[PDB]
């Protein structure tokens, strides 16, 4: 969550601290790393 290291809630409200997000209606490259094939591809001896 970045360089934020206080255990007290900031004095100012959330909407005044930063831009409030809006919705309509790492995400992908972390799905790629888990898909990585790692097992042996041939018959081990």
């Amino acid at each position: 969550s970045g360089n934020t290291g206080s255990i007290i809630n900031n004095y100012y409200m959330q909407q005044y601290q930063n831009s409030m997000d809006t919705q309509l209606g790492n995400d992908w490259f972390s799905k790629l790393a888990s898909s990585a094939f790692s097992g042996l591809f041939g018959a081990l001896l």
Partner: protein, 184 residues
């Protein structure tokens, strides 16, 4: 671990192929919203200058882990050594606006003046490169003016990026890029 190479499918074989045993690998220092929050310093201009996240140099730690992501969104922070009555217009104000006091204006108070201003732009997410090098006018955060701006710093908050881009290390002439390291 032979597998079809012309497939762009990631294949990460591990040390357990010949008896090894992978220790635990914890990565906190390399996150994308933890490494960008560090007050990179930009070459400050004269009286009036614009808050564009691309005038930061391309060889810093924030300027170079930013030109590795095609798109990015991040709130901003500054800390300037204004010699005057620095003001700040939002994105898209007529450049004659930063002469009026109704706009957010900080008064002089030694030594710095640290502000935390939001992200205001029409586009849902900015971009480093643009296939129209000059980017459009719409890509910025605002413009500050003072009598004489002395210092300026950028600290992105809540940063989140998409669509990575190449990073380049320095090319050494020798076989290995040797240099000094601190030593008692």
């Amino acid at each position: 671990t032979t597998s079809t190479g012309e497939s762009a499918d990631p294949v990460t074989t591990t040390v357990e192929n010949y008896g090894g045993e992978t220790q635990v690998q914890r990565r906190h220092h390399t996150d994308v919203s933890f490494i960008l929050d560090r007050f990179v310093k930009v070459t400050p201009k004269d009286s009036i200058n614009v808050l564009d996240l691309m005038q930061t140099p391309s060889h810093t730690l924030v300027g170079a882990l930013l030109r590795t992501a095609t798109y990015y969104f991040a709130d901003l922070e500054v800390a300037v050594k204004h010699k005057g009555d620095l003001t700040w217009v939002p994105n898209g104000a007529p450049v004659a606006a930063l002469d009026n006091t109704t706009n957010p204006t900080a008064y002089h108070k030694a030594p710095l003046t640290r502000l935390a201003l939001p992200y205001t732009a029409p586009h849902r997410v900015l971009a480093t490169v643009y296939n129209g090098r000059p980017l459009p006018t719409s890509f910025n955060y605002g413009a500050i003016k003072a009598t004489r701006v002395i210092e300026l710093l950028y600290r992105m908050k809540r940063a989140e990026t998409y669509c990575p881009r190449p990073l380049l290390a320095v090319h050494p002439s020798a076989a290995r890029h040797k240099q000094k390291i601190v030593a008692p």
